[PDB]
Amino acid sequence: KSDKPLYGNDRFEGYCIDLLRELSTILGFTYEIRLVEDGKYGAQDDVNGQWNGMVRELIDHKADLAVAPLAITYVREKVIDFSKPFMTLGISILYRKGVFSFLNPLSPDIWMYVLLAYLGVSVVLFVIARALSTRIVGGIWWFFTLIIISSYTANLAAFLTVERMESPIDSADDLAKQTKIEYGAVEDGATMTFFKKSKISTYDKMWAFMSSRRQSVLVKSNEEGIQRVLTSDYAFLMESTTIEFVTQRNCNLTQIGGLIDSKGYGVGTPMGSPYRDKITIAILQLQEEGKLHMMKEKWWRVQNIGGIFIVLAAGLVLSVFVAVGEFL
Amino acid sequence: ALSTRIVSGVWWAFTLIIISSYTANLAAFLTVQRMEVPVESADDLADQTNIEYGTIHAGSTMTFFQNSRYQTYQRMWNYMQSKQPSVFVKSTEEGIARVLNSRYAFLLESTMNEYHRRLNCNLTQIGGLLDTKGYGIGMPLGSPFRDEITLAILQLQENNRLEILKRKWWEGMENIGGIFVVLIAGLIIAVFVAVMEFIYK
Amino acid sequence: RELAELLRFRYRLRLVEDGLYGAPEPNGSWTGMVGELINRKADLAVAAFTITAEREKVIDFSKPFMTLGISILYRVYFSFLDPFSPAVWLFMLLAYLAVSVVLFLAARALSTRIVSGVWWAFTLIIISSYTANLAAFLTVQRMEVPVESADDLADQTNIEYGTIHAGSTMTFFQNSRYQTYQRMWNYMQSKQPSVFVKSTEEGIARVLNSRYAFLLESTMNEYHRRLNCNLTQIGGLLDTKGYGIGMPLGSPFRDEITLAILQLQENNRLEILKRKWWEGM
Amino acid sequence: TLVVTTILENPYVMRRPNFQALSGNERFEGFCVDML
């Protein structure tokens, strides 16, 4: 994007544009870059069987080179051949990362009626001034505070125990058993295939939840999935190097979990494009060069107890003021 | 004053142990009560051999789950087929009945769960939408007005009285509270005791 | 050695050429040393050849040296204020000094009664919070199993189920029919570039490296867990097996091998060899 | 005069209890019935 008109073989930039440039400088190839008409990475169809998108286009042999971040899938290997792996990759999951909370685990009407009872028992003690009676009253007050403070510790115990048992979701199975953050990817995904055509039953049920709500769950674009994750809990399954060059420039995001599968994007060609092998050879030559890695550099770059502390300190100041009143 | 000191010490040890035990036991009870989901996502109910997965027998839902392809839905088809005379039920009102009778869930339609759960209080609409569907105007293939059906259908949705018809016909603190009772009671009791003492005077 | 002392002949013990445990490949061929016995490349396949079904129909297996089973080899004064959020305690002691300081200012009984009740309320709350939070901490630690039945680790996508690559165990789980074992075969096949590993010492290594379990033999888990302490023998025996004396079909002494094998078990120096080599507060 | 048939299911067709059941359309009423 810039302040003039370019087009075609000039309207693009990135790392794969540099891949086209250096692969051209190796193989002596000339090239014009054209986008995908279907606007997706494309897949073999759900019922038609034919490929979609750029996979359809190189399947139609309508364009020679396909230097995109395109996954070398074994199902995709049957539709068309590929060179050696350009950048190693894998699927990974991307998702984002008071003074009543003292009295929290007791429901507030109870703690109100507690102070009411404290005043009431104080009133009965004052009315005792018209000591066995004093003793009996003191003892019921004992039982009272005991049940209350004890049950308090029970409620704060349990409600701390559950929330310290829940968080976070830091694994693939963690996103799998949950049903809260929406989990998916962009449309026509080789990533969405590698989830969808998998046999690892966790990933299978993740495909079931995704393709279940496939209107709203799946996305259309990786940037669209980024907006869906940065806006709400539509967490995206996504590619490795994409997750890196997303996460390095969006701190509110986070790259949860490990590596789901192991893949690698690379130069794709139709079956019988003769420059495939020599292109793979010069790709190995560029991997020996390091301009792959140089390009990767150049482009792929007192929770609540504090509340009651405040409460106590406030009481302290108030009573010191009461003591000033006494001195007066 | 050491003899009474012996009884004070043992009494403190005892009252402390019993109080700590009681707070422990109430801690464990509340914790277990809170930690039970018990069956929210449908996949658990498919694995839940003690709950009964159920569908409107020989239904479109049975067509969906029974002819499905997704793995947990496939295990649901297997369990729905497996003890099916014990497991399938035909009538929708009987579906609400077996829901309100034992640990069998009626896999009903969305609008079915809507009209039922609005009509009946004790039935919970567990799970989310398992898939997408729509009750459509069926006809024979190549119908005399199928295009006209969709046309006047979009007209009526544009007339929006269909949604009007949807509205028309498709329409702690109390746990531990007994402590307050014990309190007031003993308070009154000792008030009486002190009044008796004033009388003695 | 004692087997040859029975059979009175020498034995050219050689390395298996592939050195794999051997498996019937989809080309019909048994691989590895099972390949060597399917080749007649050797007659006395003397190893820990797990006598299995596909091991049976490809070459004869004599009476077993021992029983065997599939087991999972997996990994494994400062708690005082530790359940409290560890910066709160400094503010706590500061508050204690402060509340005493307000009292010492109150020296030079209702005004003191005010701060008494306040200090009591705050004391009750925060030690109740401490006992609650230590209750939650001790509860979470106790409630973790974390993976004991192998079916869990089959469902557990976060721990790596692993087997000795192209092993007899890979046959026993991969060609299996039981449903959870079938899903284990699927996951063992699925991300196998991450998931399978070949050498048994490397198996103990990868178990000692990350959250991958070596689905090893019973006596394998025995010699390893007796040798190394940090590895736990998770699961029970997944099935029955036995490293039996493999031979070609109709061997020159196969019945005699089982015979002198039962003699040596009757001589019981095999078990002698099993000892001598297979050895809060 | 179109053969518009159904199997009653609450509340789609209310299946109101008109024990004096009339003919056809006047036999029962509901959401799907008023929709038709």
From Swiss-Prot, chain A:
Annotated localization: Cell membrane; Postsynaptic cell membrane
Membrane-crossing segments per the record: 109-129, 140-160, 305-325
Keywords: Cell membrane, Disulfide bond, Glycoprotein, Ion channel, Ion transport, Isopeptide bond, Ligand-gated ion channel, Membrane, Phosphoprotein, Postsynaptic cell membrane, Receptor, Signal, Synapse, Transmembrane, Transmembrane helix, Transport, Ubl conjugation
Topology, Extracellular side: 161-304
Entry binding sites for L-glutamate: P69, A71, R76, A190, T191, E239
Tissues/organs with expression: Highest expression is found in the olfactory lobe, piriform cortex, dentate gyrus, hippocampus, granular cell layer of the cerebellum, and in caudate-putamen.
Single Gene Ontology MF annotation: scaffold protein binding
Glycosylation sites noted in the Swiss-Prot or TrEMBL record: N252
GO CC terms: axon; dendrite; dendrite cytoplasm; glutamatergic synapse; hippocampal mossy fiber to CA3 synapse; ionotropic glutamate receptor complex; kainate selective glutamate receptor complex; membrane
UniProt modification remark: Sumoylation mediates kainate receptor-mediated endocytosis and regulates synaptic transmission. Sumoylation is enhanced by PIAS3 and desumoylated by SENP1.
Keyword DNA-binding: no
GO BP: any one term: regulation of membrane potential
General remark: The postsynaptic actions of Glu are mediated by a variety of receptors that are named according to their selective agonists. This receptor binds domoate > kainate > quisqualate > glutamate. It does not bind AMPA without coexpression with GRIK5.
Subunit structure, interactors included: Homotetramer and heterotetramer with GRIK5. Tetramers may be formed by the dimerization of dimers. Assembles into a kainate-gated homomeric channel that does not bind AMPA. Can form functional heteromeric receptors with GRIK4 and GRIK5. Can form functional heteromeric receptors with GRIK3. Interacts with DLG4. Interacts with NETO2. Interacts (via C-terminus) with KLHL17 (via kelch repeats); the interaction targets GRIK2 for degradation via ubiquitin-proteasome pathway.
First and last residues shown, out of full length: 448 to 843 of 908
Swiss-Prot record, chain C:
Tissue specificity of this protein: High expression in the cerebral cortex, pyriform cortex, caudate-putamen, hippocampal complex, medial habenulata and granule cell layer of the cerebellum. Weak expression in globus pallidus, thalamus, colliculi and the reticular thalamic nucleus. Expressed at high levels in the trigeminal ganglion neurons.
Localization in the cell: Cell membrane; Postsynaptic cell membrane; Presynaptic cell membrane
Topological region Extracellular: 139-281
Residues with glycosylation annotation: N27, N230
Residues annotated as transmembrane: 87-107, 118-138
Similarity remark: Belongs to the glutamate-gated ion channel (TC 1.A.10.1) family. GRIK5 subfamily.
Function of the protein: Ionotropic glutamate receptor that functions as a cation-permeable ligand-gated ion channel, gated by L-glutamate and the glutamatergic agonist kainic acid. Cannot form functional channels on its own and produces channel activity only in heteromeric assembly with GRIK1, GRIK2 and GRIK3 subunits.
Known partners and oligomeric status: Homotetramer. Heterotetramer with GRIK2. Can form functional heteromeric receptors with GRIK1, GRIK2 and GRIK3.
Protein name: Glutamate receptor ionotropic, kainate 5
Gene: Grik5
Full-protein interval shown: 452 to 801 of 979
Curated annotation (Swiss-Prot), chain D:
Tissue expression from the record: High expression in the cerebral cortex, pyriform cortex, caudate-putamen, hippocampal complex, medial habenulata and granule cell layer of the cerebellum. Weak expression in globus pallidus, thalamus, colliculi and the reticular thalamic nucleus. Expressed at high levels in the trigeminal ganglion neurons.
Localization, UniProt: Cell membrane; Postsynaptic cell membrane; Presynaptic cell membrane
Top-level taxon of the source organism: Eukaryota
Function description: Ionotropic glutamate receptor that functions as a cation-permeable ligand-gated ion channel, gated by L-glutamate and the glutamatergic agonist kainic acid. Cannot form functional channels on its own and produces channel activity only in heteromeric assembly with GRIK1, GRIK2 and GRIK3 subunits.
Protein family: Belongs to the glutamate-gated ion channel (TC 1.A.10.1) family. GRIK5 subfamily.
Quaternary context: Homotetramer. Heterotetramer with GRIK2. Can form functional heteromeric receptors with GRIK1, GRIK2 and GRIK3.
Name of the protein in question: Glutamate receptor ionotropic, kainate 5
Organism: Rattus norvegicus
Originating gene: Grik5
